[PDB]
A paper describes a structure:
[name] is specific for galactose β-1,4-linked to glucose or GlcNAc [lactose or N-acetyllactosamine (LacNAc) motifs, respectively] found in glycoconjugates. The N-terminal region of [name] comprising amino acid residues 138–993 has amino acid sequence identity with GH family 2 enzymes. Through detailed structural and functional analyses the molecular basis for the catalytic specificity of [name] is defined and this activity is demonstrated as critical for the ability of pneumococci to utilize complex N-linked glycans as a carbon source and protect the bacterium from opsonophagocytic killing. Further analyses also revealed the presence of non-catalytic CBMs within the C-terminal region of [name] that mediate adherence to host cell surface LacNAc and/or lactose.
However, fold prediction using the Phyre2 server, which does not rely on amino acid sequence similarity, distinguished two regions (XII and XV) with a high probability of adopting the β-sandwich fold common to many CBMs found in CAZymes. The two predicted CBMs were recombinantly produced and the polypeptides screened for binding to all commonly occurring monosaccharides by UV difference spectroscopy; only D-galactose gave a signature UV difference spectrum consistent with sugar binding. Subsequently, this approach was expanded to the relevant galactose-containing sugars LacNAc, lactose, galactopyranosyl-β-1,3-N-acetyl-D-glucosamine (lacto-N-biose), and galactopyranosyl-β-1,3-N-acetyl-D-galactosamine [Thomsen-Freidenreich (TF) epitope] and binding was only observed to LacNAc and lactose. Significantly, the CBMs only bound with significant affinity to sugars that are substrates for the catalytic domain. A single bound metal ion was modeled as Ca2+ on the basis of coordination geometry and B-factor analysis. The shallow LacNAc binding site sits at the apex of the β-fold opposite the N- and C-termini. Tryptophan 1514 lies directly beneath the glycoside bond and coplanar with the disaccharide thus providing CH-π interactions with both pyranose rings and a higher affinity for β-linked disaccharides than for galactose alone. This binding site architecture accommodates lactose and LacNAc, but would limit the recognition of other sugars terminating in β-linked galactose.
Residue numbers in the entry: 1466 to 1644
C-alpha cells in the first residue's frame, strides 16, 4: 500500500475534498480529515441530509506538495455512516476528471453546485472501467473499490440516497497511490 493521496495536510489547500451539495453542519472537509466515526461520539461526516437533491457527489481534487497535481488512481475506499435518517446510497457511479480545462479549487467546496465550476459540467467526467466493488454497500466499515488505473486531477463518487433515508452519509474516504 502506497501513499495516501486523499488526506488533508495542515496549511495546504490540496488535496481538497469537494461535494455538489451538503448538509451545512456536515461539511465535505469531514471526509478527508483522518477522523473515522460511525456514531455521534464524535459526529464526523459529510451528509446531504434534508437537502433538496436526492443525488450528490463527493470527490478529492489532488495535490503534490501544496500545488495541483494529476495522480495515477486505481482505487477508492468509502466508509459509509448510517443512523435513522442517513445511510449508504442505493446507487452510485465512480467517475474521473477528463476536462481539458485545468480545475481550480472551488470557492465553496461543500456546495460546488452553487458556483460556476468545471466539475458541474458532465462532459468533464467519465466512468471508471472494470470496477470491482462490494456486492452490497455497507455502513459501518470502509467499502473498497478498484478499477483501471487513470491519470487524473480528480475522482468523485456520485450517489443517490436510499428511499427510506433523508440523505447519504460518509465519515471518511481514502485513496492510495501505487506502492
Ligand atoms: C430531534 C431531531 O429531529 N433533531 C434534528 C437532528 O436529527 C438533525 O441533525 C441531523 O440528523 C441527521 C439524522 O439522519 C444526520 O445525523 C445529520 O448528520 C445531522 O446533521 C439537526 C440538523 O441540524 O436538526 C435537529 O432537529
Ligand atoms: Ca472523517
Amino acid at each position: 500500500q502506497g501513499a495516501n493521496i486523499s488526506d488533508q495536510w495542515t496549511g495546504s489547500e490540496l488535496p481538497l475534498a469537494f461535494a455538489s451539495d451538503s448538509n451545512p453542519s456536515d461539511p465535505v472537509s469531514n471526509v478527508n480529515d483522518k477522523l473515522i466515526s460511525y456514531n455521534n461520539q464524535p459526529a464526523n461526516r459529510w451528509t446531504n441530509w434534508n437537502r433538496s437533491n436526492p443525488e450528490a457527489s463527493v470527490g478529492v481534487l489532488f495535490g503534490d506538495s501544496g500545488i495541483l497535481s494529476k495522480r495515477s488512481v486505481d482505487n477508492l475506499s468509502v466508509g459509509f455512516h448510517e443512523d435513522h435518517g442517513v445511510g449508504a446510497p442505493k446507487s452510485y457511479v465512480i467517475e474521473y476528471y477528463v476536462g481539458k480545462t485545468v480545475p481550480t479549487a472551488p470557492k465553496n467546496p461543500s456546495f460546488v453546485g452553487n458556483e460556476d465550476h468545471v466539475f458541474n459540467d458532465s462532459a468533464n467526467w467519465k466512468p471508471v472501467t472494470n470496477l470491482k466493488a462490494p456486492a452490497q454497500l455497507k455502513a459501518g466499515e470502509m467499502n473498497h473499490f478498484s478499477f483501471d488505473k487513470v491519470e487524473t486531477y480528480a475522482i468523485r463518487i456520485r450517489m443517490v440516497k436510499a428511499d427510506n433515508k433523508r440523505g447519504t452519509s460518509i465519515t471518511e474516504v481514502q485513496i492510495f497511490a501505487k506502492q
